Ligand binder design. Structure first.
Ligand SMILES: Nc1ncnc2c1ncn2[C@@H]1O[C@H](COP(=O)(O)OP(=O)(O)OP(O)(O)=S)[C@@H](O)[C@H]1O
Ligand SMILES: Nc1ncnc2c1ncn2[C@@H]1O[C@H](COP(=O)(O)OP(=O)(O)OP(O)(O)=S)[C@@H](O)[C@H]1O
Ligand SMILES: [Mg+2]
Ligand SMILES: [Mg+2]
Lengths: 48, 364, 406, 275
């Protein structure tokens, strides 16, 4: 059973609200299908 | 299982009564973040083996999705697609006539109901008086962290029964944390762990989930000394500095040359009134032109107005370090603001050998 | 034993929760007489009338209509000729939906047609039917009030008899109508007020909690009547009823209180007690703000005290995170070596959590241009509320208490 | 819909179903081209002011088509506002309806009495005094026959139960119920109103926040010996009062910073509260 990989390139330009919505929705369906996130950050990691 | 939750369970069991009996049209439950509303309500519904539909308001961000999900899950318990609330009511009356749904109360569990007030104006009044409209022995539950005072519509509607889940205490938290002890060591060992952890972090972190997560993270270093070879003083002395290091992060879990000068000049322009500009830069006694003049004054070398500096400006805008204020079409009088913390600008100034404090008017 | 308790529980739950019809009517004799007389006039003859009923929500507006209909429909075979249509302002928000509901209720979709065609002349050309309009005020907020105008026109016409009934909570329903419909509206209004004294409210309470004469067990019913009569003159029960009557005279709240009182009836206690009513009243009359404050933490309490100090020093002015942080630093710096060595991010997270609970609201909302810092925040609490909540705080330390007093 | 009037007229004259634009085009073709000699068309349009459009194309077509000789169309426009052809209608069509404006003055009390007498010929049911008073009230209030008939019917109904019947009808179907609603209000609501009045007299402004009103209410309750009220109780009372449109408030999100404005005159409140 292969997982799914999603790449977010420029999160600085991303609006927050869609980010929190996607995180909260995907949390309740991890059992349905695995999900892993890869973050590419240009600035220091503190920005997260 | 639920621990130290027996009053609310008994109240809810008495409220439900028998399956054929009726109940309140709307019950509003409110509490804190770590109160366990979802756990308690779902465990109770599973234990009583009642027909219940669990719905997340966040997932159903649209009215059609909400109604279709509710109807499809109810049908699965007993394809249908609906668009309007009246059609939903009619189909709900059609679908509830099942033999398993004849003399039983229907429960519609809704959590994260704080978003319902931002969906539609009449959706909440319709949900509140569902039992009158359907007349089919239907009950709807609410789970939220906001009080009912902010859920009241302007026109007023049928008042639900308000309920509160009690806040946790030291003994309650200790019991909950010590229930799931690891089988590889004594219960008293984990109890002492929970005791010292509560004595350290109860002042700030009262979240059960967060404190449990911290315990899970830090337990292996708790158990290292005994493996290396019931010595309370030895354990505390070996473990104390790690606890102080951990508490530093409770909730937390190299620019180009000219970019640094641009950043410090932007900070100065943002935090220095224009009246004092000549007082700090003129040899004898915010818009882009002010920034250019300040940058020309600061840098000891003559910098040519190459397009690359404008590219640096735009890139700094992109990186959310400088915020554009004026209209995007107005690129002849643009306005900017600096959002960099003072410690950050002091740190970047040190790497350049520049004393920014000597020029800050506010400090002087 | 258990069976009698189950039966009485079922009967009272049906009486309160579902609001089943009952023959008992309180202070509405004249209004019901007028409404029933006019309904009989509209039914036995071809004459048309329009009436609006005005009252506070929860005052049994629907009950009067339901009782009158149950009284007058079954008089003769007129009910066969009489047709009834019920429309609610909440379910039908658009004129298209209202027209669709009207067509479907009349079983004329076969005659009119199935498709989404906007023509309504199929009904209009063909047009005794009674109309019931729940939440009549909402229909006045439509774009052109076309449905209301057409209903008034057909009521004033000499083609077919039509009865129009509307329900409204607003007292200014006359000025929410346009000039044309107001002129065409027959000025028949009925007002539902709780025009009765406290002893009459006591009588209503005594009668409502009285078992009906159709209960199987008669001696148990008589004992229940004796118990409720004895509980009627008890001064604690009278005090609770007086408090709730001072708060509001609506019968819906009384029904809710009676329902909550009956929840604590078990086998060991077949008959109620004044202490049960006291407990129900206490549970029904608690303030949510103090409960929210009680469940906070120490850092939030300190931040709230700093906020109160800001409101005191700067009279009725907004604030931001930096000033609160600076004065919290001042407080922790005056004390020699108190254990409050906390960094900026944890205080920022605490402020974010406080703002999440909606105890603090922004002014002239904007984002991007202004950060979370340097944002104008205001408090939504009173000083006496903070003092009362802090008085009942379980383990408030002495230092923070004395800082609050200062 | 406004454009659907093109479909209505076409279906009334030929029974054909077409789109709004196509019906307009077909009507234009029929009324501009020399077709078969048809009977003179009498068109009546009711409630003209409700056909307004930002482009004014429908009104221009309606009042321009009879100008054509081939139209054979006579149009009568019934409306309530006489200013419509001036401030609502543009110049070229204003001159088209200019100098052909009929204004119907309201009936004089003599006209109303004549109408009532014609309604009740050969029937001696009402005394002349009631009839004269009803016609005179109608003249002095609106001069409308509809409300006159309503008053007469209500007087008949009350007589079933003289000038007293007409007086009861006129002062029941015209007078406001704010005074009696305030009279039947609860004690706490009366105290709230008194606190609002006292705060307004102290300040002089017509808008006040909920906090100052709450403080005044607490002071009045302390003066009256009433038990100390909670904030939630006062908010519930205010929400109930705002529901019946006696006040003005937006309590959906704001709780302690709610602006309150009186929906009735201050003197009416004083005259209701003095008793
Ligand atoms: N009374 C309890 N008994 C046992 N475990 C509990 C209890 N309350 C909470 N927990 C545990 O703590 C976890 C976190 O609680 P939650 O259920 O997430 O809190 P919540 O009240 O539902 O708030 P939300 O809606 O999730 S933000 C639960 O998943 C349980 O494992
Ligand atoms: N005169 C009355 N006689 C009998 N019961 C009454 C009377 N007035 C109020 N009630 C009761 O008051 C309770 C609440 O009234 P409701 O029926 O909920 O209000 P309503 O008539 O539905 O009006 P709205 O605006 O639609 S909520 C019901 O249980 C009624 O039986
Ligand atoms: Mg939950
Ligand atoms: Mg109703």
């Amino acid at each position: 059973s292969p997982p799914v990989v999603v790449i977010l390139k420029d999160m600085e330009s991303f609006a927050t609200k869609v980010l929190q919505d996607f995180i909260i929705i995907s949390s309740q369906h991890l059992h349905e299908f695995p999900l892993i996130l890869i973050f590419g950050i240009a600035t220091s990691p503190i920005i997260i | 299982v639920v621990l130290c939750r027996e009053s609310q369970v008994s109240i809810l069991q008495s409220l439900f009564g028998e399956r054929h009996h009726f109940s309140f049209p709307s019950i509003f439950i409110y509490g804190h973040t770590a109160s366990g509303k979802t756990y308690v309500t779902q465990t109770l519904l599973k234990t009583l083996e009642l027909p219940h539909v669990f719905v997340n308001c966040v997932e159903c961000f649209t009215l059609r999705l909400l109604l279709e999900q509710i109807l499809n899950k109810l049908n699965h318990l007993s394809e249908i697609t609906c668009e309007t609330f009246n059609d939903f009511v009619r189909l709900f009356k059609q679908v509830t006539t099942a033999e398993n749904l004849k003399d039983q109360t229907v429960y519609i569990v809704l959590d994260k109901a704080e978003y319902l007030r931002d969906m539609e104006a009449n959706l909440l009044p319709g949900f509140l008086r569902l039992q009158e409209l359907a007349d089919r022995n239907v009950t709807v539950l609410f789970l939220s962290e906001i009080v009912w005072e902010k859920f009241r519509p302007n026109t007023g509607c049928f008042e639900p029964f308000v309920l509160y889940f009690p806040d946790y205490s030291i003994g309650n938290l200790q019991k909950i944390l010590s229930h799931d002890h690891p089988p590889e060591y004594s219960a008293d060992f984990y109890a002492a762990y929970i005791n010292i952890l509560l004595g350290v972090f109860y002042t700030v972190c009262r979240d059960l989930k967060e404190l449990r997560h911290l315990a899970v993270l830090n337990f292996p270093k708790y158990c290292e000394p005994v493996v290396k070879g019931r010595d309370t003083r030895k354990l505390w002395r070996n473990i104390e500095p790690h606890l102080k290091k951990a508490m530093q992060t409770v909730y937390l879990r190299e620019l180009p040359y000219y970019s640094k000068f641009i950043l410090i000049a932007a900070y100065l322009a943002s935090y220095n009134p224009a009246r004092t500009d000549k007082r700090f830069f003129l040899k004898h006694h915010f818009p882009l032109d002010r920034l250019l003049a300040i940058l020309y004054s600061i840098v000891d070398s003559r910098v040519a107005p190459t397009a690359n500096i404008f590219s640096q400006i735009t890139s700094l805008v992109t990186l959310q370090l400088l915020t554009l204020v004026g209209h995007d079409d107005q690129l002849d009088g643009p306005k900017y603001k600096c959002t960099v913390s003072l410690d950050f600008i002091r740190a970047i100034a040190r790497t350049v050998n520049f004393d920014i404090i000597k020029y800050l008017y506010d400090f002087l | 034993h258990t069976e009698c308790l189950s039966q009485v529980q079922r009967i009272l739950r049906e009486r309160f929760c579902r609001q089943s019809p009952h023959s008992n009517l309180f202070g509405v004799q004249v209004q019901y007489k007028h409404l029933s007389e006019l309904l009989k006039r509209t039914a036995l003859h071809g004459e048309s009338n329009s009436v609006l009923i005005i009252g506070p929500r929860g005052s049994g507006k629907t009950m009067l209509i339901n009782h009158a209909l149950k009284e007058l429909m079954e008089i003769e075979e007129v009910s066969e000729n009489v047709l009834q249509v019920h429309l609610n302002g909440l379910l039908q928000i658009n004129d298209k939906i209202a027209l669709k509901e009207i067509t479907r209720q009349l079983n004329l979709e076969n005659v009119v047609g199935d498709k989404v065609f906007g023509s309504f002349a199929e009904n209009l050309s063909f047009l005794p039917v009674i109309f019931i309009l729940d939440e009549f005020d909402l229909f006045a907020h439509h774009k052109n009030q076309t449905l209301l105008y057409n209903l008034f026109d057909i009521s004033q016409s000499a083609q077919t008899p039509i009865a129009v009934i509307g329900l409204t909570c607003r007292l200014d329903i006359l000025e929410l109508l346009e000039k044309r419909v107001k002129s065409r509206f027959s000025h028949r209004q009925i007002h539902l007020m709780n025009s009765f004294g406290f002893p009459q409210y006591v009588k209503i309470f005594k009668e409502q909690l009285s078992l009906p004469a159709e209960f199987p067990d008669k001696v148990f019913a008589e004992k229940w009547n004796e118990n409720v009569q004895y509980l009627s003159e008890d001064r604690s029960v009278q005090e609770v009823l007086q408090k709730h009557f001072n708060i509001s005279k609506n019968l819906r709240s009384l029904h809710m209180l009676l329902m909550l009182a009956l929840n604590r009836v078990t086998a060991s206690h077949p008959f109620m007690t004044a202490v049960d009513l006291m407990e129900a009243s206490q549970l029904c009359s608690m303030d949510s703000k103090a409960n929210i404050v009680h469940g906070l933490s120490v850092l939030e309490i300190c931040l709230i005290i700093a906020m109160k100090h800001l409101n005191d020093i700067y009279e009725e002015e907004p604030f931001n995170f930096q000033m609160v942080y600076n004065e919290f630093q001042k407080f922790v710096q005056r004390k020699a070596h108190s254990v409050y060595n906390f960094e900026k991010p944890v205080v920022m997270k605490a402020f974010e959590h406080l703002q999440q609970l909606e105890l603090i609201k922004p002014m002239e909302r904007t984002s991007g241009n202004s950060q979370r810092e340097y944002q104008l925040m205001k408090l939504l609490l009173d000083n006496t509320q903070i003092m009362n909540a802090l008085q009942k705080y379980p383990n408030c330390p002495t230092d923070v208490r004395q800082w609050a007093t200062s | 819909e406004p454009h659907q009037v093109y479909v209505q007229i076409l279906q009334k004259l030929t029974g054909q179903k077409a789109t709004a634009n196509h019906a307009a085009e077909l009507l234009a073709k029929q009324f501009c081209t020399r077709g078969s000699p048809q009977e003179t068309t009498v068109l009546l349009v009711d409630e003209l002011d409700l056909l307004w459009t930002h482009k004014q194309d429908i009104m221009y077509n309606l009042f321009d088509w009879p100008t054509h000789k081939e139209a054979r169309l006579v149009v009568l426009a019934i409306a309530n506002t006489m200013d419509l052809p001036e401030r609502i209608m543009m110049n070229r069509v204003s001159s088209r309806l200019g100098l052909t404006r009929m204004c119907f003055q309201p009936y004089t009390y003599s006209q109303l009495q004549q109408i009532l007498r014609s309604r009740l010929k050969h029937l001696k049911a009402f005394e002349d005094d009631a009839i004269q008073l009803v016609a005179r009230k109608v003249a002095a209030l609106s001069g409308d026959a509809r409300r006159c008939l309503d008053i007469c019917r209500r007087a008949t109904e009350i007589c079933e139960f003289t000038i007293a019947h007409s007086m009861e009808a006129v002062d029941e179907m015209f007078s406001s119920s704010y005074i009696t609603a305030i009279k039947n209000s609860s004690v706490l609501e009366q105290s709230f109103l008194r606190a609002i009045l006292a705060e307004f007299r102290r300040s002089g402004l017509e808008e006040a926040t909920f906090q100052q009103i709450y403080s005044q209410h607490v002071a009045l309750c302390r003066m009256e010996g009433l038990p100390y009220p909670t904030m939630s109780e006062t908010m519930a009372v205010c929400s109930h009062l705002g529901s019946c449109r006696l006040l003005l408030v937006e309590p959906s999100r704001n709780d302690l910073l709610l602006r309150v404005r009186l929906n009735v005159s201050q003197d009416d409140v004083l005259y209701a509260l003095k008793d």
